[PDB]
């Protein structure tokens, strides 16, 4: 019955991180005709419903409605359910998106009817975006030959932090030692992440709208030297990290169209576009919308590591020959999202989040090694946290969006075979809604945020575990609670703390105190040795600060 | 100007070999709604138009109407053209399909309107066909354990011929020395080709409807031991031919859905389904319907060689690990169709027919090594003809559907370097409309048919060149004309001669004298040494005989 929506369509701490295709939602669409027994929506009504669908529903159900974390909603199925059921079900609204920009999920009576009617109609597929379109958008502002041959500014590049100023479609380059904002660059679109070339010279940013900008950090005044659009919705980018392939390539991953694109690392020239449409690994059924999630770069082979979400495939893409393209399509687990390499940089550990599993790939051998349930609900590691547990040896950790647990997996087949690829411990942190866990080789602490927790005090704090004191005896390791938001001294709203990121020396860890566009935000720097406040960064230009990426730690994959 | 149809839609000798999706056409489809400004068709009208479209137009324009050899006909494009233009253009008739069973390409006034209206409507994609559907159709009639452990009949299996009795969906197993039809087996729909397992024990047939049957030639009475459906439209199948992998796998290629499927070589259990939807190699644009054409098997690596037509990709699929799937996606040339391995079985030479090119792949290194224009119009080699030319060295030959030329390409990069992958000679045979060229290591003759030629005298005859008499002087080699149809003694609507195939010893070559379903056909056996008529195979059961495959020559790729 429609009342089932109370368990499926309400907001959880772990169902707020699904795609909001708000850039694609801006495209106008033609209203389809309606077959017998179905009523057509006008052009305005259809577009209104389509916008809501793309912004709020497509993340879980797909723009093509073939299903993702939520079931398929194709016309054959919806027509059988009927308008009445749909209307009653949709009245409850849908899960809220991310705080500080996402939807509340609430719908008016008029919107409810629009959505019910929209679901009964046949949807068209949004436009593709291929080479012609990419080349049209491709602009090389400063040709390689016109760029410096050595660093021309006096900045400490490796200790620089590239910070997303989300809603303003800008990034701030901040000195990691003095905390001075060296520059604020416009990208004209919300940047999702910053990635660095292996040499650390080139800064790449990917906008949610599919726009890629590459910045030359050696310039007297660093700016975008090249840009290109690779799709309509994208969230991932990475650079080549195999020795000998430094600065050779960059790769971007898109949600729509479902594809990844390999670009020249110096000019962004689009070299190879690969569709991710394909078969699910387990039921082996065609899926028309397998989104690219995290993309990492192998340190063992000249390959990119691409997570394809809906089909549960991890692709190892060899970039040594883009014409005779070698790839290894690894059957893993559905709903692959993020992950990171272990301390040795040999194994890729990734969260198939909706299924509570960690998938482990051996990047040297190019094969699946393990799939283990974390015991928690919806793991979201970011790139995770590698450390040497006093008892267990090398481990990689992840926290969860669905509960307060932190899980550790052994990552040393050679030295600790009995612990390898096994969940060794699970213990509580602040609460549910965590997004990022962090540590550094020079730190004895493990930091865990709780960004999406519904309690302001919790979402504004961070749990810190003392790795040195961990025994792994089965008890719950104690943690210190750092009042990060409180330290920032922000009066308005309930700012959420998100994502720890260390400086190059691994002596200070930064957190974003994230408030909405029309509210006050800040960055808080914590002295890692003492766990005391080091500095609070505030500036009128620091609007909606979210992701932060230290140049050195990003270029070297140190986490 | 709709009058352009006189040229665009004119029947030619080289545009009759495009897909007719007559099995898929059998599916009944519901009429879509018509958007504002468009008139709707009833379910009956739409279904009628859909059938015609799939049978006569989809081959060139695509079932999704995104274009193949003919341009896209999507609603956005057709609505701009308007009903009047479409109606007028389509009135001129479309290209005829293949002789005997293909369409005439003529429509009634009522049908013309149905088609024009159909083109203005939004088409739905035909159903997918995944693992669940394949497993539901999977039937193992005789489990491996219950099959013979040695040959239980007295047949000379290696000299046996598996002949397609087209329209009736049967195959005739015919003795290569006595010419006796040993048995006629039913599979349902028209079998397109017969392929043999590497051991020569299992005979695999693929029906145009996607039905695969595997027959155990060791049975006292050979019959199907397993069957499975792998799609709705399919034309290709092959077996594993890497030493050590005999009888391990079989692979089938489909037109719809666009995918290939690897099956267990002993039971047909479906193991891995791969979608071929993807990007075109050159302008890198997404194509939603890249059909699988020829599929060969590597003798150098445990891989299948898959031609993907519309995108111009040749896939080398490693079957040693189906979970961590390694493939090489080779950018080649669009419109890949058929081809064969050179005499050394190392290089795959294939025709990108619409572009008059021969693409050469090194199966050992897994890379493209050449793309050469044949100088002729629309090459169609079948598997081609390999021979050691007296002056040029090893060469592979192809004839053409669009003209009377025979082209020779050097196939010896190590031994005849300058001649390698270059068109060394081109000369005329009987006339245009050729489909197959053939030779055998034990023969000094090169046979060339002219099946689609408009002249009965030509379509019912074969050209024969004496390889020993070939010089490298650039002149045109003479040929003897064998009156194959005349030798058969059949007076019906100009039966067409097609496809030479040799017996095991290469001492006799067979040709099909292909007439319609309600007409008389025959197989003509020619004595290779004397080039004289040896025997004519006639039987009331021998209806629409087309493809012939000798067990030995097929299992060993001897051509
Ligand atoms: C696929 C993906 C990655 C992996 C990138 C990679 O490794 O190359 C990623 C990583 C990230 C990372 C990576 C951190 C790291 O250390 O690697 C961060 C900081 C981040 C901050 C946010 N993300 Fe993210 N994010 C999505 C997708 C993704 N986010 C979404 O689909 C979602 C849920 C909604 C949307 O439509 O964008 C979403 C919302 C957010 C936010 O609201 C965050 C908190 C703030 C913001 O700026 O948008 N995402
Ligand atoms: C993809 C493909 C192959 C390669 C198979 C492989 O390598 O495994 C092939 C091969 C073939 C071969 C392979 C010969 C060989 O020696 O390998 C033959 C005999 C053949 C006889 C015909 N083919 Fe064929 N053929 C098609 C497709 C193909 N044909 C079509 O799409 C088309 C044009 C129309 C259709 O809808 O089927 C078509 C019509 C025909 C015919 O009308 C022929 C002459 C008679 C028949 O039985 O249908 N096709
Ligand atoms: C992910 C966080 C979701 C969002 C956002 C939306 N939906 Fe959803 N929906 C989701 C789930 C988990 C389920 C239950 C079934 C399952 O997949 O486990 C649903 C179900 C529906 C239904 C009912 C379908 C049926 O009973 O067959 C409808 C009609 C539906 N969802 C509509 C819908 C719309 C219009 C949304 C945007 C306003 C939307 N959903 C968002 C998960 C998620
Ligand atoms: C391949 C042998 C074809 C068959 C069979 C059919 N069509 Fe075709 N069509 C083909 C070509 C080569 C062209 C010219 C344009 C090009 O791609 O080079 C066309 C053109 C059309 C058009 C005109 C479209 C325009 O924009 O002007 C229409 C409306 C069309 N074809 C319709 C159509 C239908 C309905 C067919 C089956 C009855 C059909 N075509 C078959 C090639 C081929």
B72 min Cα distance to partner chain A (Å)? 15
Q: Which residues of A318-348 are buried (b: 16+ CB within 10 A; e: fewer)?
A: bbeebebbbbbbbbbbbbbbbbbbbbebbbb
* B95 Cβ closer than 6 Å to some ligand 2 atom: no
Query: Is B61 an active-site residue?
Result: yes
Q: Least CA distance to B74: which residue of chain A?
A: A124
Question: What resolution in angstroms, rounded to 1 decimal?
Answer: 1.3
Integer Cα distance of B162 and A27 in angstroms = 56
The number of helices, as runs of H, and strands, as runs of E, in chain A is 10, 35
- Pair A312, A293: CB distance under 8 Å: no
B195's CB contacts (< 8 A; 6+ apart) are B203, B204, B205, B206, B237, B238, B239, B250, B549, B554
Full strand arrangement of the beta sheet holding B191-196: B139-140, B224-229, B211-216, B202-207, B191-196
Query: Would you say residue A362 lies in a domain?
Result: yes
Q: Which of B257, B283, B330 sits opposite A324 (nearest CB)?
A: B330
> Could you tell me if B329 lies within 8 Å of chain A, comparing CB atoms?
yes
Expressed in angstroms and rounded, the spacing between residue B18 Cα and the centre of ligand 4 is 12
CA nearest B496: which of B444, B532, B455? B455
Copy the structure tokens of residue B334: 């669009």
> What 3-state class would DSSP assign to A162?
strand
Q: Are residues A89 and A196 in the same domain?
A: no
Copy the structure tokens of residue B350: 């294939």
Integer Cα distance of A55 and A70 in angstroms = 15
How many CA atoms lie less than 13 Å away from B336 in the CB half-sphere? Answer: 33
Q: Are residues A325 and A411 in the same domain?
A: yes
> Could you tell me if A32 lies within 8 Å of chain B, comparing CB atoms?
yes
Residue A109, phi then psi, degrees to nearest 5: -60, -40
- Pair A524, A509: CB distance under 8 Å: no
- Pair B59, B68: CB distance under 8 Å: yes
Integer Cα distance of B201 and B216 in angstroms = 6
Expressed in angstroms and rounded, the spacing between residue A120 Cα and the centre of ligand 3 is 14
Integer Cα distance of B198 and B244 in angstroms = 10
Query: Is A141 an active-site residue?
Result: no
Query: How wide is the angle at C-alpha B429 spanned by C-alphas B424 and B432, nearest 5°?
Result: 110
Nearest ligand by distance to the CA of B70? 4
The DSSP letter of residue A260 is E
B98 min Cα distance to partner chain A (Å)? 32
Pocket test for ligand 3, best of A2, A8, A11 (most atoms within 8 A of CB): A8
Task: Answer whether the bond into residue A257 is a cis peptide, omega within 30°.
Answer: yes
Q: Is A374 left (phi over 0), alpha (psi -120 to 50) or beta?
A: alpha
Tell whether B546 is in a known binding site.
yes
Query: Mind spelling out the 3-state secondary structure of B412-456?
Result: CCCCCCCCECCEEEEEECCCCCCCCEECCCCCCEEEECCCCCCCH
- Pair B10, B400: CB distance under 8 Å: no
CA nearest B74: which of B141, B11, B119, B42? B119
Give the other-Cβ count within 10 Å of A541's Cβ. Answer: 12
Which of A80, A97, A127 is a domain's end point? A127
Q: Strand ranges (DSSP E) for B62-103?
A: none
- Pair B313, B260: CB distance under 8 Å: no
A154's CB contacts (< 8 A; 6+ apart) are none
Do the Cβ atoms of B366 and A327 come within 8 Å?
no
Integer Cα distance of A38 and B326 in angstroms = 46
From the number of C-beta atoms within 10 Å of its C-beta (0-12, 13-18, 19+), residue A136 rates as exposed
Do the Cβ atoms of A331 and B321 come within 8 Å?
no
> What 3-state class would DSSP assign to A385?
strand
Copy the structure tokens of residue A494: 């309930």
Expressed in angstroms and rounded, the spacing between residue A249 Cα and the centre of ligand 1 is 22
Query: How wide is the angle at C-alpha A363 spanned by C-alphas A358 and A364, nearest 5°?
Result: 140
- Identify the residues whose C-beta falls under 6 Å from ligand 3: A 8-9, 15, 18, 56-57, 59-61, 69-71, 73, 81, 86, 89-90, 94-95, 115
Q: Are residues A111 and A160 in the same domain?
A: no
The DSSP letter of residue B40 is -
- Pair B230, B134: CB distance under 8 Å: yes
Q: Are residues B149 and B287 in the same domain?
A: yes
Copy the structure tokens of residue B313: 């990709």
> Could you tell me if A30 lies within 8 Å of chain B, comparing CB atoms?
yes
Query: How wide is the angle at C-alpha A541 spanned by C-alphas A538 and A544, nearest 5°?
Result: 80
B88's CB contacts (< 8 A; 6+ apart) are B2, B5
Q: Which residue has the tokens 């390694």?
A: B326
Torsion of CA A291, A58, B291, A317, to 10 degrees: 0
Q: Is A268 left (phi over 0), alpha (psi -120 to 50) or beta?
A: left
Q: Are residues A93 and A185 in the same domain?
A: no
DSSP β-ladder status, A393-399 and A405-410: antiparallel
Q: CA separation (Å) from A476 to A395, A418, A428, A479, A552? A: 17, 22, 7, 9, 33
**B131: chain A residues, CB-CB within 8 Å:** 283-285
Q: CA separation (Å) from B405 to A270, A457, A537, B380, B425? A: 40, 82, 77, 11, 10
- Residues B46, B49, B53, B54, CA torsion sign: positive
Query: Mind spelling out the 3-state secondary structure of A111-156?
Result: HHHHHHHHHCCCCCCCCCCCHHHHHHHCEECCCHHHCCCCCCCCCC
* B56 Cβ closer than 6 Å to some ligand 4 atom: yes
Residue B150, phi then psi, degrees to nearest 5: -160, 165
Q: Which long-range contacts (CB under 8 A, 24 or more apart) does B532-540 make?
A: B533/B487, B534/B508, B535/B179, B536/B487, B536/B488, B536/B489, B537/B174, B537/B179, B537/B181, B538/B488, B539/B181
Integer Cα distance of B407 and B422 in angstroms = 10
CA nearest A351: which of A335, A370, A362, A329? A335
Query: Would you say residue B3 lies in a domain?
Result: no
Query: Would you say residue B91 lies in a domain?
Result: yes
Integer Cα distance of A235 and A228 in angstroms = 14
Do the Cβ atoms of A326 and B331 come within 8 Å?
no
Give the helix ranges, DSSP H, for A20-95.
43-52, 58-61, 75-81, 83-90
Query: How wide is the angle at C-alpha B257 spanned by C-alphas B278 and B368, nearest 5°?
Result: 40
Task: Answer whether the bond into residue B257 is a cis peptide, omega within 30°.
Answer: yes
* B60 Cβ closer than 6 Å to some ligand 4 atom: yes
Q: What is the CA radius of gyration of chain B?
A: 23
Copy the structure tokens of residue B110: 């009522």
Integer Cα distance of B500 and B461 in angstroms = 11
Give the other-Cβ count within 10 Å of B533's Cβ. Answer: 16
CA nearest B523: which of B484, B494, B482, B481? B484
From the number of C-beta atoms within 10 Å of its C-beta (0-12, 13-18, 19+), residue B165 rates as buried
Domain that holds residue A235: 128-559
Which of A107, A127, A147 is a domain's end point? A127
A354's CB contacts (< 8 A; 6+ apart) are A69, A334, A335, A378
Integer Cα distance of B545 and A210 in angstroms = 55
Integer Cα distance of A366 and B320 in angstroms = 13
The DSSP letter of residue B57 is I
> Could you tell me if A481 lies within 8 Å of chain B, comparing CB atoms?
no
Integer Cα distance of A157 and A313 in angstroms = 36
The DSSP letter of residue B345 is S
Copy the structure tokens of residue B123: 């088409």
The number of helices, as runs of H, and strands, as runs of E, in chain B is 10, 35
- Beta bridge partners, B282, equal none
Query: Would you say residue A6 lies in a domain?
Result: no
Query: Mind spelling out the 3-state secondary structure of A298-359?
Result: CCCCCEEEEEECCCCEEEEEECCCCCEEEEEEEECCCCEEEEEECCCCCEEEEEEHHHCEEE
Residue B374, phi then psi, degrees to nearest 5: -80, -15
Q: Which residue has the tokens 């270029």?
A: A555
- Pair B470, B515: CB distance under 8 Å: no
DSSP β-ladder status, B259-264 and B522-527: unpaired
Query: Is B287 an active-site residue?
Result: no
Nearest ligand by distance to the CA of A545? 1
> What 3-state class would DSSP assign to B316?
strand
Expressed in angstroms and rounded, the spacing between residue A9 Cα and the centre of ligand 3 is 6
Query: How wide is the angle at C-alpha B19 spanned by C-alphas B13 and B25, nearest 5°?
Result: 135
Copy the structure tokens of residue A18: 């699904």
CA nearest B37: which of B65, B72, B78? B78
Q: Return the CATH number at B431.
A: 2.140.10.20
Give the other-Cβ count within 10 Å of A427's Cβ. Answer: 18
DSSP β-ladder status, A545-550 and A160-165: antiparallel
Integer Cα distance of A507 and A445 in angstroms = 11
* B235 Cβ closer than 6 Å to some ligand 2 atom: yes
Q: CA separation (Å) from A179 to A27, A536, B229? A: 40, 9, 65
Query: Would you say residue A4 lies in a domain?
Result: no
Expressed in angstroms and rounded, the spacing between residue A212 Cα and the centre of ligand 4 is 39
Atom of ligand 4 at shortest distance to CA of B59?
5
**B34: chain A residues, CB-CB within 8 Å:** 33
CA nearest B402: which of B441, B353, B365, B440? B353
CA nearest B347: which of B330, B335, B322, B334? B330
Integer Cα distance of A546 and A170 in angstroms = 11
Integer Cα distance of A39 and A45 in angstroms = 12
Query: Would you say residue B139 lies in a domain?
Result: yes
Ligand 2, atom 43: closest residue by C-alpha: B546
Integer Cα distance of A335 and A354 in angstroms = 6
Q: Which of B41, B281, B303, B326 is the best substitution to test chain A (most A C-beta atoms within 10 A)?
A: B326
Q: Are residues A170 and A112 in the same domain?
A: no
Integer Cα distance of A510 and A462 in angstroms = 11
- Pair A519, A513: CB distance under 8 Å: no
What's the N-to-C CA distance of chain A in angstroms? 47
DSSP β-ladder status, A211-216 and A303-308: unpaired
A504's CB contacts (< 8 A; 6+ apart) are A158, A159, A176, A550, A551, A552, A553
CA nearest A270: which of A278, A279, A261? A261
* B254 Cβ closer than 6 Å to some ligand 2 atom: no
Q: Are residues A166 and A46 in the same domain?
A: no
Do the Cβ atoms of A368 and B327 come within 8 Å?
no
Integer Cα distance of A445 and A463 in angstroms = 10
CA nearest B75: which of A163, A223, A2, A31? A31
Residue B185, phi then psi, degrees to nearest 5: -105, 145
Q: CA separation (Å) from B246 to A267, B146, B214, B215? A: 48, 20, 15, 16
Q: Which of B127, B286, B303 is the best substitution to test chain A (most A C-beta atoms within 10 A)?
A: B286
Integer Cα distance of B94 and B294 in angstroms = 26
- Beta bridge partners, B34, equal none
> Could you tell me if B328 lies within 8 Å of chain A, comparing CB atoms?
yes
Copy the structure tokens of residue B143: 């489990």
From the number of C-beta atoms within 10 Å of its C-beta (0-12, 13-18, 19+), residue B474 rates as exposed
CA nearest B551: which of B186, B195, B190? B195
Q: Return the CATH number at B122.
A: 1.10.760.10
Integer Cα distance of A197 and A217 in angstroms = 11
Q: Are residues B307 and B394 in the same domain?
A: yes
Query: Would you say residue B524 lies in a domain?
Result: yes
CA nearest B380: which of B11, B2, B16? B16
Integer Cα distance of A195 and A214 in angstroms = 10
Q: Are residues A66 and A141 in the same domain?
A: no
Do the Cβ atoms of A329 and B330 come within 8 Å?
no
- Pair B374, B406: CB distance under 8 Å: no
Q: Which helix (H) or strand (E) holds A454?
A: none
Q: CA separation (Å) from B116 to A11, A315, B82, B91, B167? A: 49, 44, 9, 10, 30
Integer Cα distance of B94 and B420 in angstroms = 40
> Could you tell me if A4 lies within 8 Å of chain B, comparing CB atoms?
no
Copy the structure tokens of residue A121: 């109609």
Q: Which of A261, A321, A326, A361 is the best substitution to test chain B (most B C-beta atoms within 10 A)?
A: A326
Query: Would you say residue B21 lies in a domain?
Result: no
Do the Cβ atoms of B130 and A277 come within 8 Å?
no
Instruction: Report the domain count for chain A.
Output: 2
A213 min Cα distance to partner chain B (Å)? 22
From the number of C-beta atoms within 10 Å of its C-beta (0-12, 13-18, 19+), residue B363 rates as buried
Integer Cα distance of A448 and B492 in angstroms = 84
Q: Which of B32, B128, B270 sits opposite A286 (nearest CB)?
A: B128
Residue A115, phi then psi, degrees to nearest 5: -65, -40
Q: Are residues B198 and B258 in the same domain?
A: yes
Q: Which helix (H) or strand (E) holds B135?
A: helix B131-137
Integer Cα distance of A263 and A250 in angstroms = 5
Which of A127, A149, A178 is a domain's end point? A127
Give the other-Cβ count within 10 Å of B72's Cβ. Answer: 14
CA nearest B255: which of B501, B6, B60? B60
Q: Are residues A107 and A254 in the same domain?
A: no
Residues 74-113 of B with CB under 8 A from A: none
Q: Are residues B294 and B370 in the same domain?
A: yes
* B558 Cβ closer than 6 Å to some ligand 2 atom: no
Q: CA separation (Å) from B352 to B69, B316, B436? A: 11, 17, 16
Q: Which residues of A88-114 are buried (b: 16+ CB within 10 A; e: fewer)?
A: bbbbbbbbbbbbbbbbebebeeeebbb
Q: How was this structure determined?
A: X-ray
């Amino acid at each position: 019955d429609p009342a089932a929506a109370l368990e499926d369509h309400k907001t959880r701490t772990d169902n707020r991180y699904e795609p909001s295709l708000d850039n694609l939602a801006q495209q106008d669409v033609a209203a389809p005709g309606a077959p017998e027994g179905v009523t057509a929506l006008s052009d305005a009504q259809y577009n209104e419903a389509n916008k809501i669908y793309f912004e709020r529903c497509a993340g879980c159900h797909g723009v093509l409605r073939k299903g993702a974390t939520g079931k398929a909603l194709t016309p054959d199925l919806t027509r059988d359910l009927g308008f009445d059921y749909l209307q009653s079900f949709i009245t409850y609204a849908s899960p809220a998106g991310m705080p500080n920009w996402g939807t509340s999920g609430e719908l008016s009576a008029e919107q409810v009817d629009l959505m019910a009617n929209y679901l009964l109609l046949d949807p068209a597929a949004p436009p593709e975006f291929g080479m012609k379109e990419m080349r049209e958008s491709w602009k090389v502002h400063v040709a390689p030959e016109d760029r410096p041959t050595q660093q021309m500014n006096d900045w400490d590049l490796e200790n620089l932090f590239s910070v997303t100023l989300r809603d303003a479609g800008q990034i701030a380059l901040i000195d990691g030692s003095t905390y001075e904002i060296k520059t604020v660059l416009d990208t004209g679109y919300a940047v999702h992440i910053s990635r660095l070339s292996a040499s650390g010279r080139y800064l790449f940013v990917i906008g949610r709208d599919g726009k890629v900008n590459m910045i030359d950090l050696w310039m007297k005044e660093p700016t975008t030297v090249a840009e290109i659009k690779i799709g309509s919705e994208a969230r991932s980018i990475e650079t080549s990290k195999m020795e000998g392939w430094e600065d050779k390539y960059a790769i971007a991953g898109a949600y729509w169209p479902p594809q990844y694109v390999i670009m020249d690392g110096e000019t962004l020239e689009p070299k190879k576009i690969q569709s991710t449409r394909g078969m699910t690994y387990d039921e082996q059924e065609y899926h028309p919308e397998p989104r690219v999630a995290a993309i990492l770069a192998s340190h063992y082979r000249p390959e990119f590591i691409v997570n394809v979400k809906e089909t549960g495939k991890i692709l190892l893409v060899d970039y040594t020959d883009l014409n005779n393209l070698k790839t290894t399509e690894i059957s893993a687990e559905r709903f692959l999202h993020d992950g990171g390499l272990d301390g040795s940089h040999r194994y890729f550990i990734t969260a198939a989040n909706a299924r509570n599993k960690l998938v482990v790939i051996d990047t040297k051998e190019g094969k699946l090694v393990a799939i283990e349930d974390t015991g928690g609900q919806t793991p979201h590691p970011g790139r995770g946290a590698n450390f040497v547990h006093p008892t267990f040896g090398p481990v990689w950790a992840t926290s969860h969006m669905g509960d307060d647990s932190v899980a550790l997996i052994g990552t040393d087949p050679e030295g600790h075979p009995d612990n390898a690829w096994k969940i060794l411990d699970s213990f509580p942190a602040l609460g549910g809604g965590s997004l990022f866990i962090k540590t550094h080789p020079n730190s004895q602490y493990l930091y865990v945020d709780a960004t999406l927790n519904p309690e302001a005090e919790i979402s504004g704090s961070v749990a810190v575990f003392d790795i040195k004191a961990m025994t792994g005896d089965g008890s719950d390791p104690e943690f210190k609670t750092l009042p990060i938001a409180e330290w920032a001294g922000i009066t308005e709203g309930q700012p959420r703390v998100v994502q720890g990121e260390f400086n190059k020396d691994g002596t200070e860890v930064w957190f974003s105190v994230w408030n909405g566009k029309d509210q006050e935000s800040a960055l808080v720097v914590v002295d890692d040795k003492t766990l005391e406040l080091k500095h609070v960064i505030k500036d009128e230009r620091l609007v909606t600060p979210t992701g932060k990426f230290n140049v050195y730690n990003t270029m070297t994959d140190t986490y």
